[PDB]
Each structure stands twice: as structure tokens, then as C-alpha cells.
Symmetry: D3
Amino acid sequence: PNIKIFSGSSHQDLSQKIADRLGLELGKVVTKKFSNQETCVEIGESVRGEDVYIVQSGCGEINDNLMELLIMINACKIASASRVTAVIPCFPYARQDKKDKSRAPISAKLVANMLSVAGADHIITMDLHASQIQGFFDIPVDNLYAEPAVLKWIRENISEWRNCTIVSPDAGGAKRVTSIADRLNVDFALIHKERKKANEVDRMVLVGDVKDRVAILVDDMADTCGTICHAADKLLSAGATRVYAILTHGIFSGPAISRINNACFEAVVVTNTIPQEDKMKHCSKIQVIDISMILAEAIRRTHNGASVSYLFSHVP
Amino acid sequence: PNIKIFSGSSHQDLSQKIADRLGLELGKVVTKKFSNQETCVEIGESVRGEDVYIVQSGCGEINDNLMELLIMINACKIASASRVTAVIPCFPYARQDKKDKSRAPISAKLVANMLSVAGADHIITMDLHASQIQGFFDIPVDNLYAEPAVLKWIRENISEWRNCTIVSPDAGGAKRVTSIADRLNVDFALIHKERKKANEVDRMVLVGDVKDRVAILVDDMADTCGTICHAADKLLSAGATRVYAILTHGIFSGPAISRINNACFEAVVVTNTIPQEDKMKHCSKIQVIDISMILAEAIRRTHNGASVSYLFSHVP
Amino acid sequence: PNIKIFSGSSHQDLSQKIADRLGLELGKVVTKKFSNQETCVEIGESVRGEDVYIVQSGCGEINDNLMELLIMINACKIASASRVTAVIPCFPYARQDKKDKSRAPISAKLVANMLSVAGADHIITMDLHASQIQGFFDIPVDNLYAEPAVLKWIRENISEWRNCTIVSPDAGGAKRVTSIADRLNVDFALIHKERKKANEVDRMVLVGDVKDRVAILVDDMADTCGTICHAADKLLSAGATRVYAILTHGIFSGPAISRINNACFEAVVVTNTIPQEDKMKHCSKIQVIDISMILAEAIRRTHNGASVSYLFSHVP
Amino acid sequence: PNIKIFSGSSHQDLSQKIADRLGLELGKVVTKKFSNQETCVEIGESVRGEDVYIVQSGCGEINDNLMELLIMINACKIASASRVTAVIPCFPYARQDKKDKSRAPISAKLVANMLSVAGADHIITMDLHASQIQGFFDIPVDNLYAEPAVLKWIRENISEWRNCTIVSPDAGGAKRVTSIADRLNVDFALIHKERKKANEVDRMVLVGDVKDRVAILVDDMADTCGTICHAADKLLSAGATRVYAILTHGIFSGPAISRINNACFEAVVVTNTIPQEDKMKHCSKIQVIDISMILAEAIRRTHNGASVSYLFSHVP
Amino acid sequence: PNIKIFSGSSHQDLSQKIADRLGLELGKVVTKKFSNQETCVEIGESVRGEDVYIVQSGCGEINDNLMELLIMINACKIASASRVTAVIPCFPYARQDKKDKSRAPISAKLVANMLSVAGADHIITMDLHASQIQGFFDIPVDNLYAEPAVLKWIRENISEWRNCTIVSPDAGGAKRVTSIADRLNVDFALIHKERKKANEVDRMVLVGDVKDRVAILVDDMADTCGTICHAADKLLSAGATRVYAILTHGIFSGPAISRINNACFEAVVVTNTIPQEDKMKHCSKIQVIDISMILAEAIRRTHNGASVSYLFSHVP
Amino acid sequence: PNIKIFSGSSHQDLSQKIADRLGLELGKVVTKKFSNQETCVEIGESVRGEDVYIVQSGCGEINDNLMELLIMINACKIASASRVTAVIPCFPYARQDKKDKSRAPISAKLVANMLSVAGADHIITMDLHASQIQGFFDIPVDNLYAEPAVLKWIRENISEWRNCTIVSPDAGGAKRVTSIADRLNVDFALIHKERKKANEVDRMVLVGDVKDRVAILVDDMADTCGTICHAADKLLSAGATRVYAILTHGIFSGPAISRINNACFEAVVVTNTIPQEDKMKHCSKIQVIDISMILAEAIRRTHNGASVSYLFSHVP
Ligand SMILES: Nc1ncnc2c1ncn2[C@@H]1O[C@H](COP(=O)(O)OP(=O)(O)O)[C@@H](O)[C@H]1O
Ligand SMILES: Nc1ncnc2c1ncn2[C@@H]1O[C@H](COP(=O)(O)OP(=O)(O)O)[C@@H](O)[C@H]1O
Ligand SMILES: Nc1ncnc2c1ncn2[C@@H]1O[C@H](COP(=O)(O)OP(=O)(O)O)[C@@H](O)[C@H]1O
Ligand SMILES: Nc1ncnc2c1ncn2[C@@H]1O[C@H](COP(=O)(O)OP(=O)(O)O)[C@@H](O)[C@H]1O
Ligand SMILES: Nc1ncnc2c1ncn2[C@@H]1O[C@H](COP(=O)(O)OP(=O)(O)O)[C@@H](O)[C@H]1O
Ligand SMILES: [Mg+2]
Ligand SMILES: [Mg+2]
Ligand SMILES: [Mg+2]
Ligand SMILES: [Mg+2]
Ligand SMILES: [Mg+2]
Ligand SMILES: [Mg+2]
Ligand SMILES: [Mg+2]
Ligand SMILES: [Mg+2]
Ligand SMILES: [Mg+2]
Ligand SMILES: [Mg+2]
Ligand SMILES: [Mg+2]
Ligand SMILES: [Mg+2]
């Protein structure tokens, strides 16, 4: 079997980068819409007995892209592909990973079941919102970390990183922030927005010392940037000299760009798990860490039957 | 268990009509989008041990609506509903019902598998593009006919219906047209657009006599109205006095409204399996047959454990 | 893995032809009946890690043959075959492909489920009664066409084929007839037997002109030959000079042979998806198109991981 | 839900007896064959939300009957039956319950999988050839014993039963014979036909004393009656005064009737799990124990949610 | 259907409390070991059509208890129970909820799959180590919180609770601690043990102010009490006046009792999701919050088809 | 793919013997217990695309070992092993192979389902208590016989084996004893312990002649040795000169060692499907037949795609 890399409509630049790093051309696929807005998928080459990797991030037109991915997976399976792997850099519906409300769906589990029934044999993803999403499948799920790439960026772009403090913008980010602070041998802090019992002012509590130090906000994603912007205001109010925000998934939906442009961030750093070209044109603060080498190495090692553990300590 | 009727975002007027005919209020659901365009479903009441019917047509934002339906089905199942029925008046991806091309997906089968894995126990639909789609599920699938409603409209709105000829706009509609012509005891004709071997003019062949008679075009759907418009030009060129078009699914995507407005149709008749309010505002030729009573009777009989065979001979 | 071709009891001559065209000997199998008429299957060689193809048509003792096929598939799967493919030239129960009656089974779907649970990984079949039967499986299903072979026979055996008209014996055959007429660039006609509302005479309506022309009846199968015989009487009554019947599946059950012998057919042409040796001995009108090369090429390309699209335009 | 009893073509007299004992009429079903010998099943009434019991023994046209049963189960499931139970008095392919030969199928497991995929929720059967066949399903399987009925017949029809010896015709029947001998407080013996190493005379070894005593052969089934006839010759050669044969499944296929008529049996006693009317007309030695009351009580208790343990100690 | 409560060997006192609160006697079960240490389960009453709840905590002989639970679930399913619910107060293998190491199993997912294949229809559990474990099943999973009971204990047993600080013993507990601190309107702190890069001294970093205040350690479980004991030493070194530890799962395996007896805890508070009678006899610091009313109310509401949302705000 | 042999904690000496006979080192696995007695499995090497064989007998801590095996299978599957085979020399819960009691579980079927859901693709086992357990899986199950090894031991260690009688200790062993007696061309006898109707003395009935002959007791297993010890007393009381006991599974749980030491056995012969080192230290009568060559040959032939039928006639 040979590696066949197919791109959905979501992140074709990332698919191209992965294919170039693998020394391959992208597989021939036409991914369009019928007139009635139904997804049209036209695989333009044989995948018989091939090791098919379909790159599709959960971003942009989320349901459009997920349906595109499912249809492409099913087409490859029925076309007798040896193995179909869904390379999903940003897993859609990952934040709907539990039922903590009455009648609430576990949409991440539904997406996992849909991918399984479409015929996916393997999932490659980066920085799942909850790592337990790996357990939502009965197939192997590669949950790659952007943490080695983040540490590289911090050590190369922040002069006073050895005296910085890594700040969690919410309680759920504490593990990620503590891991990064341990790897950098720096202090960490946590910011919590307390629960909205009524319609008074949202107030943020900070635990840890950030006074007269550079604060680096690290989180898994910035959707509306309410979390990071509120954390940035709190950090400046607490005496932080400079505030950075580093995310792996830059969703930047809704008012995020205006929020960042009016915030105090020295830089907002995201990976290219989601296309950022449009976002960077309206926000100069955004910088992008390319993770295409990580995904390409993961795909290559999966095809060659080699461990991907190397990707959790080094940036290829 | 009690009937709980929940509406998706696709066709809420039809859901309201069904609920009124059942003497029920629609179940409390908030069906919106998160900022990143992920589907948000918030069922606002208990469905524990309830007989849940979710009405969602395949129309409008097709993938949005299908994801909404799947998430609502899964939420109801995890919320311990006694039974979850997907009422899908127009089945999405129904035209992708076979693999007659290399690497082509069977998207209808994928949609069926997705509905099954979401937890649907029963499907109620009207005039499947292919009746074999019933076989795409392992659960009961009700394929209701709009044919009794069509015959009623013909007998009440076309004065010379006894001398009319029912015309198939393509080869695939022949069974539907022959059934309607048999029930009306009238002649039938078939129109075929021959295959596009090169870039010459599309030419249509008509088999059957339509000269100096009213021609009624009957088809399962009109998406772009290319089929019915080309058939209408052919029918007028063949000497038909007046031309009607009767569909059960009025999709009317893309250039359909301009095509119909510039066509020669006496009337374009569709059911309300798809919302038509917007379409009727720009095309006076469109008339709507309400099928909400058929769907409501089907839901009521399904809940009561009664046969729906009555719906195939009478309009309630 | 190597190709292993195993024959059921249904069509062993076709299995032999396929094996010869593949340059192989048929796999050693004893397919008999126990005393109590239970199917006895004794695979006489190892199939470990082999690519097993089991040839069994739906014909003759239908349930006997289907049980034989299921038992052989399961034996091969438990015997650790790398892949088990059911080569079913005529799919049994294919006409029971929908539920258009109360309490009616979808027997084609049940057969598909039985084949899936027996362990079939791939289905190769010719001219499914409904192409949507491909969607009854979750495994790849090859629906080969006899159409290229039919066109070859028409062009080589009917002198006036360029002025002929291809006739559908019922409404359901319209797509097949229009496709053949398009490929031959000839006229087409359709014959419909209207529905039996009471016990009066069956009357047939013909749409299209067949007067003073050769009429070629093309259908997917002739079971009792009531359809083709009634169509032939109608065609002669309408002024057809000569009438041919071309089918892909010659079932010829019940009174079919006497019907054909007393009909006006110039020739009844069938493929050898079903054994015809016995039928030809009692009806001189029957001629057979060998499709063993099509099936052998399909098996060879499936084993080699090559597209079978070539089989839809050429006869190997 | 109400009990609906449907009969297949195999044993309709037993179905009638069960229905009468349940105070019910048999459900309306037409079970015939299409012209091409495909099974035709036409359920003539609604089974929506009903507790459906389908009676079909593995006998006669075995594959015909099993396909009939599977099609009826699937039709009832798709017709929205509350529960479908297969009442299979003699389980087909039960003797193919293991793989003790190369490439041998486990046909009993395949039949179980086929019943499961057809949609059976419950199996009721009598005296499985191997009780482990219960483990071939993931649904409850009732393995009823004819042993209480056998003991009743022995105590009422054999005057010297207290001095009799119960004889196993092969090694596999030892458990059944020891159980019966324990319940009767009588001696037991075992007869073994040693393995056929070459083409010499089949010789039988008897362990136990049968001299000058009545010998009762007890086995689960008599297919060709080779086992019981050879055992009977051995028992007479060993000095048995009279020889009885008691089976629960009288298959009597092939040469069994001539074998019994030429044997020395005082009586051959079978249950009516298989129809015996034809067999009794050609062999006066055959007597029938009616087990319809056992099956009817099992069905009634299954419907009422009551234990069937009472059936293992008493004959209702 | 009626509620049937069955106890495994793990926590029979809790099962008794649940049954008493439900006004029921525990179902008759013998749960012992065969001589070869295989689990022996003997359900002593009919569960036909019953709503069966099996109470079995993951504690004590973990694999013994889990096998007991699986065997009891399967026995109830095969015994035709209407519904089988596994009441697992402490979910076993819950800490193995992801693959963050090469070749690491997701044992929680395996346990979920085993429960699903045993036939569980519903899971009721308290304070899952990861709430995403709900997504490891395709059945409803009730993840009850001990948080209302913890808050009650704090408000009734700690006089200076309004000036206390709730302390997370690790980064993963941050969400739980922030939720509790929000509900109490008190400060929170977090303690992190940094990663063991080499064999130097384990050092703990504290973020937040605990000086001259009562510190309440809140975590989901205390297995070896290394986390809470190290956190307690850090808290005293940081100037905390008194230190409490509140857990929901008191596992107290290995050296935990000696660790607590030599620690500085004012009280170690656990729920009775795990039996604590033996632990309290050797450690006077341990106090137990009874959660049997929460579990009993959850079971009762599940049986009655009522929401369990009330249990997340009130202690019944 | 390469053979990877992994050992569980149950029988590591047998795993070592298998690996040596295969010319391999055992795969690196740490199989320990967490503090709370949960099974900890740490596979120490890549199994990507490997043919993994996990050796784990059902013995010792039965539930511990079975959970270990399931966790290791699941870890290998998620670690992308090409194929995972469970080598289970003594199948746990094999004696719970049917439901012959009210509410009784079929624990063997549950174990099979658990192995299937863990991801096992193949099972290799020796002398299943019931061969129908092969039918409890949908994957190939190799049921190897120790019979060739037993016959070798008898012919090499019992001087008067040609005049011996092979004795079944119960009715269920009759097939095994008759097969062995046929292969040795010797007499056989059967011993039955009649059913315990009340609390009187257990009495044993012997059928067959053992007077003044060596008696060889052959059974599938000796758990408590009650069966073989009672049979030995009966055989001596019946005039047997010497009594041997040959088993394939020596469980020797509970009072078995004291029973054997106080019995009259010339030798108790078992295979090493279960570790016997501890048992032999307290009972000099126990001798061990090494079957590691049989298991190693089975694994090697499974990997090489060769028949294992040779193992049923010869000891490698
Ligand atoms: N150091 C690590 N940190 C986090 N996750 C890891 C780590 N090592 C492995 N994983 C997880 O395990 C998966 C597979 O691990 P890998 O080392 O590539 O080999 P294997 O597939 O045999 O376990 C990765 O995709 C990742 O999800
Ligand atoms: N006359 C008919 N024409 C077409 N389809 C039919 C007809 N009668 C029944 N069906 C199909 O069968 C389904 C169920 O049939 P119904 O008569 O309601 O009872 P049952 O569910 O017991 O079969 C319908 O939803 C429809 O798909
Ligand atoms: N005494 C028995 N001997 C043999 N099989 C039995 C016996 N009792 C029960 N069974 C088996 O168990 C099945 C169901 O048992 P039953 O006592 O009716 O209640 P439950 O279904 O709750 O176990 C029966 O159909 C039969 O297969
Ligand atoms: N306030 C809440 N906090 C956390 N989990 C909750 C909450 N409300 C509901 N849940 C979760 O949802 C499950 C079921 O919710 P419930 O309100 O009882 O009704 P429903 O089952 O219809 O959703 C609970 O068992 C729990 O896991
Ligand atoms: N002589 C035999 N006696 C008993 N069981 C056998 C015998 N031959 C084969 N089997 C069974 O069949 C299985 C596989 O058989 P084998 O001859 O190795 O080839 P195949 O897997 O192709 O059937 C064995 O593992 C065993 O369970
Ligand atoms: Mg979250
Ligand atoms: Mg967050
Ligand atoms: Mg179509
Ligand atoms: Mg069309
Ligand atoms: Mg048809
Ligand atoms: Mg036809
Ligand atoms: Mg047998
Ligand atoms: Mg026998
Ligand atoms: Mg954790
Ligand atoms: Mg922790
Ligand atoms: Mg047994
Ligand atoms: Mg025994």
C-alpha cells in the first residue's frame, strides 16, 4: 500500500504542506457542493489497497467540512482502500465531550461514532480539547501535542522567558500550563472566571504572582477570545509587564479579531491546525506556528509502522 | 410513552402543522449555532420514556440540518427516550443511492448509517428518490406517498384531466407516471434527454402523444428545474396545449425560480415537504399541496401501533 | 494471497469458465446434501491467507444455493481466508428490494445481511434488479453490466439494428432501454401493462413507434416470460416486423419455455449468469451470451487492485 | 402486546396444536414459493407492538424452511413487532456445532448468526443436539427437555421398566442416558461403534449388562436410524429380551423407515417436534409423544414473564 | 417492570442502604467463588421483565468485583430482564482514561466495552475521575456528583468555612476546587507536584494564599494518599492553620492509613462509595458522608422516568 | 508482520518454552497490579503491524489473569497490531457453557464476548471443556488436543497398556475415553456418580469390566479431584490392579493435593497448560506432559498460514 493524501475543503494549504513534506502530490479529489447544498465528493483516482489519509480540520463551515470528511471516508472505504485515516488537526465538537446538563448531547461521541461508521480505521489529531476523546473511538487515535512547538517558540521569541509565568486562562487549562511551566522551569498562575450566578459584573480571580513579569497565556483554543482577553485584562491589572497568548487552535470566530486588536497582547500565537491567512490580514498580533511537519511525520510513521513518541519531545 | 414532537431548524412551519394536527405543542428545543458554526442543540424538557418524533427535512442548509437532526436524535437517545423517530419529509442525499461511477460514495447509505448510529429507531419519510433506500436501514422506514394528494389536486384543479397525458420528465420517473396515469385512467408519455456524448446541443426525445392535450409533468423532485423546464419546452414543441408540473419535493435551488418564471407552466405544484414560502414570493406559478396531515396521521398511527396503509389510498 | 475460486452447486460450468480464464483450477470443494437435506460443505484445501472467490448464482434451488453460499463463506472466514468474495452473477431475492406492501419483507436486504454476517468482504454481481442493492451492504459491491455484451450481440446479429427500436417491457426497464438506445443511436419504446383493478382482460399500452421496424425487447430478467411474451404480442399487434428479446438473467421458470416456443420471438438472448443448457434443449430460440470473461476480468482486477471501470465500456 | 403465533410450512399441525392450547388462532401468513423457487412470505395481519412467535422446525426442506423462518422474522421485525421469538422445535444444523475437521464450517453458529441478524429476540427449542448452542446466540435461548415426557411414556407403556436398562447408542448420548436411568432408578448401558480405520466390518462394543432385560435405547435424534438399528442388533446379540428406541427428534430421512421395519424394535418413540404423519403410515412401530403442550406452556410463560423451570420436571 | 436491586460482593452495606431507602429487599443472589477462584453467580429469583439494578463498586478485589458485575449483568440479560443498570459508585480503571504513553491501554474504555457487551443498558456512577468516561459508552451514563453532600459537610462541620480556602492537591483537580470555592464564595489555591525529571527531592509548588487560614483539600479520590499527604505538608509549611481533606472515593490502598495517621489532617472526609468500616477502625481521622440517599434517589428517578438534575443541587 | 509473543502473569514458564521453541525472546511487558489491585499492563515495545500472540492460561487468580489478558489484547489492538491472538491453554469459565438452571449465566459465552470486544482476532486453546465453545466466537478458534501426547505417555510409561481399560470418571467424558480406547485398541469403562436426590451416601456405578486390569482414568480436567478420586476408589473396589489418572488441565484447587496423596493412583498425569511446579512439590504422584511444543507449532503454523491438522495426529 502507498500513502494517498486527500484534502477536504477546510484546510487545503495544510494538506499541501503535509504532501510536500511527504514528497507526494495531493490525491485528486473534487470537493464541491451540489446546487441544493449537498456535499459532492468526486475522488479522481483509484485508492484500491492504498493507505488513505484524509486531511480535514474542524473549522470554517463545521458541518459542511465534517460531512465532507465522512463522505470521503466512506467513498474510500467502498473503493476498497486498505486503510482510511482521518487527519483531523482540530477535532470538531470536541468541547461537547460530556453530559453535565439535562438532555445535553455528547456531540464529540456522536462525531466519533459517525467517523467510525463511515469506516475510519485511524484518527490523527492535535491537542484534543479532552484527551479522553481518544476513548470515544474503538480505533487507534493519535492525539499529537503542539507543546514541543510552543516551547520552541517561547524560547526563541520571548527574551525573558526564564523569568516568565505561564498563565492558565481557566481552571481546565491547569494541566497544560503546569506541564509547560515544568518544561520551562518557570512559575505558573491560574485565572478563573467565577460562575455567573446572576447578571452582575463578571469578575476574575487570579491565583499566583504575575507582578512585574511577562505573562504567557497558554490554552488549547481561542474561539471568541473572551477567555484570553478577560485573562489579559486581569493580568495587566495584576501588574504583568507584557502578556502573550499561545493557543494551538486559533478559531477566532465572531468578535475575536476585534477583541484581540483592542487587547494588550504582545502576540497571539496559534498553530496552523486551522487556516489563519484571513485572520492574520486583520490582526497583526497573530503569529502562526507551522505544525505541518508534525502531522507529516505522524502520517509517515503511521504508514511505516513506527512510533510517534518522538513527536512528543521534538519538533521535526 | 407520550408523543413528543421536536422541530429542527429546517421546516418549523411543517412541524407546527403536524403538532397542531396531533393536538400537541412542539417540544421545547433550542437549535442554534455556536460561534464557530458548530451545531448547538438544547432540548428543553425531559424525554425519558417518551416516544420522540424529530421533524427535519433535507433542505436549506443540508449538512447543517442533517447534523442538527443527528445531534437531536443522539441527545434524545442518551436522555433515555423510549423511541426516537426521525421524520424526514425529504431524505437528504437520496439521489446518491448507488455507485455507478469509480470511487463514487453511496451518500444515502452513509446518511442511513449515521442516522442508525445516532440512535434512530424509526424513519418516516415521503417519496424517497429510490424506494430501496428503505433497505439502507435495519430499522422500519415509512416511505409515504404524496400520490393520493397529487391525484386529488389534479382532479380538483385541471378541468380536462380526463383527457390529459401524464408525462415523465426522465426515464427514471416512468413508474411514478405510469402509476398516476393508471389511477387517472389517462394516457402517459415519457421524455428522455439523451446522454451528453460531446458538447453539442442537448436534445430531448418524446415517446407518446401529447398533441392538443394538457400535459402534466410528474416527478419526484425539482432541484434546478432543468429537467421539468426542458421537458416543458419539448412538450410545447410537440403540440401540448397546456403544461403542468407536479412534484412532491420542491427544492428550487439555484436558477430554478428564474427558469420557472421564464417557462410555460400553467402551475408548478409541490408539497410542503420543503418550505416554499420564500419560493412562492418570487414565483406566482408555484402552488403548494399541504402534506402535514399525511405526516401527522403517520406519526399518530406509528405511536398507536396502527397500519399506515390507509395513507396510500386516501388523503386525511 | 492467491486467488482461490470455489464453485457452489448452482453454476459450475460458469465457475469452470472463470477459472480457465484466470488460468486456475477450481478449489476443491464437496457441496452435497446430508440425508436430512441439510447443506453439507467440505472445503478440500487450505484457504489460509488466501483471496477466496465463491461463485454461486441465485438460480435453481434458490434457498439451497444461498445456504450453500453462506456456509461456504463462513467456512472460508473461519478457515482464516484473507478475504472472501461472493461472486453472485444473479442476486437472489433482488426483486424483493422494498416494502411497498403492508408487512412485506425486504428479502434482498435480509440476504445482504446474511451474506455480511457470514463474513463476505466483497460482492461481485451482474445487473442487479435494483442498483440500490449495492447500498444494502456495508462492503464494496460490484454491479457489473451486461450492456457492452448486449450491444455487441445486437450489432453482430441484427442486420437492421440501426433502424431498430429498443422496447422496454415494463415501466421499470425504461432506464436500461434508454441507455441502450442512446448507445445504439436508435429509437426506443415503452410497453406498460396497466394495473389489475379487477378480473377483466390484461391490456398493454405502448408508447413509441414500432411499426414496420425490428423491435428489440431489453429487460433485466425473464422469469416466467409473461412480461416479454405479452410485450411481444403487443409489438406484433402494433406492426413490428420482427421481435427480439434480450435479457441478462434467463430464469425461465415455470411456463416460460412453452411461452417462448409459442411466441413470435426471432431470438431470446440471455447471458450465462444462470445455466441455460437445459433451457436451450427445449427452446431453440434461446441463445446465450457468455459473460464468463467479464466475471473473470472483474475477479482478476479485484485481486490485483485495479479498476473494473473498463468492463463497463468493453467486452474482454 | 399480544401473542401472535405464526406457522411456517414445516410443521403446521404442531403450530395449530400450540395455538389451540394457547386459545388462539394462527396468525394469517401465506408461505409459498415464487416461480423461481424463492421463498415468498406474506404476513396477512398487523404485528405492530405484538409478541410474535414463529413456529418452524428444522425438518423437511431444511434450507427452504430456514429461509422461510428468517424471512418471516425479518418481516415481523420491520413490521415493528414488539418482540420476535423463533420457536424451532428441532434446531437445524445442530450437529454442525464444532470445527473438528480442517476447513469445516460451524453451521449451527452460522444459523444462529443468521437468526440474530434477521432480528430474533428469543429462541425456544427442544433438546438441542448440543446444549452449548445456547451460547451461539447473544439472546435468551430456551432449551426445553423432552425428558419428562419420555419418562412418562416409559412408566406408562413398558411394564418391566423398573428392571429395564437405558442404553446409549453412542458415546455422546451418555449424559442423557445416565440422567434418564437416574430418574428411573435403573441400570444403564452404553454402545460404541468404534472408529472406521479401514474398510472392515463395523463392530460395536457394549459396556454394561443387558442380558435377559428390556433395553431402552434413548438418543436425541434418529436421522438415518443407523445408530439405533446397529445398537438394536448389538443389544439382541447381547441377550436383551426386548428393545425399545425413544428419540425426541424423529427425522427418519433416507433408509430409516426400511431400517426400522426390518429391525427388532418393540416400538420407536419420537416426539412431534418433526411431523410424523407420513412416517407412521409406512412404519407401524413408530409412536409419537405430543410435546405441543410443552411448547405452548413455554410460549405462554415467556409471554407472561414466568419461569419455564416447571417444564423440566412435569408434563403439562 | 419492578425495581430489582442486586448486590455484588464489593459494597453490600451500601446496597442494603439503597434498598432500604427504596423500601425494597435486596434481590436474592449468591456471589461466591468456585474452588479454582472463578466467579460464581447464582441469581436466586426471576428477573423476567424486571428493571434490574446491580450495585457493585470498583474497590477491594477490583478484577474479582468487575467480573462479578459483568457475569451478573449477563445473567440478568439472558434471564430476560427488561433493563439492566450497573450502579458503579466508584468506576474501576477510571484513571486509565487516555493513551498518553506508548502502547498504553485505555482500560476505562475497555471496561466500558465489557459492560456494554455484558448487556448493560444504563450506568449510574458517582464522580467519574474523568467525566468524558460518559462518552466511553453508547448507553446513558449518570455521573452523579458528591459536591452537594461535600458542601453540606463543610458548612456543618467547619466553623470558619467562610474564611477557608479550598485547595487542589494537583493540577487536574482545579475544576472541582474552583466549583466548590465558587459555591462557598471562598478563595481557592492549587498545589502542583512538578514532574520527576530525575531522582532528586519531590518539591511542591503552591499557587494561592493559605496563610493563617483553614485549608480544605478537595479531590476526587485518595488511593495511596500521597497526593493529599504531600499537599498537607506543603499547606502547613505555607502557614495554613488547619488542613482538611475531603474526597468522594476513599480507596486508602497500601500505605494510606499510616500516611494519614502520621499526617496533620483535622479530618479526612470520604463518601461511602467504597466501604470504609475497616479503614475507620485504624484511622480515627476518617469520617464518612453517606451518599446512599443520592444513589437511591437516582435509581428511583431512573425507574420512574424522572430527571436526576435535582441531585446536583440538593442532598435528599 | 513478525511473531510477537507476550506473557501474562499466569503461566510465564510455558510462555518462555513457547518462545524458545519459536526461537524468539518474549515481548517486553510489565504485568503488575496498581496499589488498589487494578491490573497494570505496560507493553514495553512497539507491536505496530505485528502478529501478536498473548499467552495467558485460565488458572491461578482467574479473574486477575483474564482481566490482564483482556487489557493486553486491547492495548495491542489500539497499538495497531496487525493481528492479536489469545493463546489460552486452559479456557477460563469453560465449564459454564450452558444455561441448565434458572437465571444461570453462560460465563464461557461472556468470556468469549469480552475477548472479542477486547479485539482478539484468533484464539488458540487446548482441550476445551466443550468443543462448542469454538462457536461462542465469530473468530477462528483453535481447539488443540492433548490426545496425541496422552497416547505417547501411555505407550511409553504403562507396560501393560495393551491390556488396560480406559475409564471415564463421569458421563461427559465418554467421547474422550472412547476415542482414546479406539486409538489404543483397548477396552473402555465408564463411571457415573448418580444424582444427589437427598443427603445419603454418594454411590458410583461402573459400566464395563476393569477386574484384574490396569485402569487409566482419562478426563479433561481435575479441579478438586473429587471425580477422579471417587472413580479411583470405585475402580479399586471393582478389582482394578493399578489406577492411573491422566488429565490435560491440572487445576488441583482446594483439597486436590491431599486427596491425591491419600488416593491409590499410580500416577496423576497432567499437561503444563497450568503451572504445576508448586503442585509437584507437594504431590510426588503428579507427572507433567509438556505441551509447549504443540502450542509453539500451532502459533508458528498460524503465523505461516499452514494447517494445524498435523498436531492432531503427532506430537512435534
Ligand atoms: N509522550 C507522550 N505524551 C502523550 N501522548 C503520547 C505520548 N507517547 C505516546 N502518546 C500517545 O500514544 C499514541 C501512540 O503512541 P506511540 O508511541 O506512537 O506508539 P504506539 O502506537 O505503539 O502506542 C500517540 O498518537 C499519542 O496519542
Ligand atoms: N400500498 C402501499 N404502497 C406503498 N408502500 C406501502 C403500502 N402499504 C404499505 N407500504 C409501506 O409499508 C410501510 C408500513 O406499512 P403498514 O401498512 O403501515 O403496516 P406494517 O408496518 O405492519 O407493514 C409504510 O410506511 C410504507 O413504506
Ligand atoms: N432444570 C433445568 N434443566 C435444564 N435447563 C433448565 C432448567 N431450568 C432452566 N433451564 C434453562 O433455563 C432457561 C430459562 O430458565 P427459567 O427457569 O425458565 O427462568 P429464567 O429465564 O429466569 O432463567 C430454560 O429455557 C432452559 O433452557
Ligand atoms: N447540573 C448538572 N451537573 C452535572 N451533570 C448533570 C447535571 N444535570 C444533569 N447532569 C447529567 O445528566 C444526566 C441526566 O440528566 P437529567 O437531568 O437527570 O435528565 P436527562 O437524563 O433527561 O438528561 C445525569 O445523570 C448527569 O450525568
Ligand atoms: N483432526 C482434527 N481433530 C480435531 N479438530 C481438528 C482436526 N483438524 C482440525 N481441527 C480443528 O480445526 C482447526 C483448524 O484446522 P486446520 O486443519 O489447522 O486448518 P483450517 O484452519 O484451514 O481449518 C484446528 O485448530 C482445530 O480446532
Ligand atoms: Mg471542556
Ligand atoms: Mg476552555
Ligand atoms: Mg436516481
Ligand atoms: Mg430524476
Ligand atoms: Mg422492481
Ligand atoms: Mg420487471
Ligand atoms: Mg455431536
Ligand atoms: Mg449422535
Ligand atoms: Mg487523570
Ligand atoms: Mg489525581
Ligand atoms: Mg460440562
Ligand atoms: Mg466433568
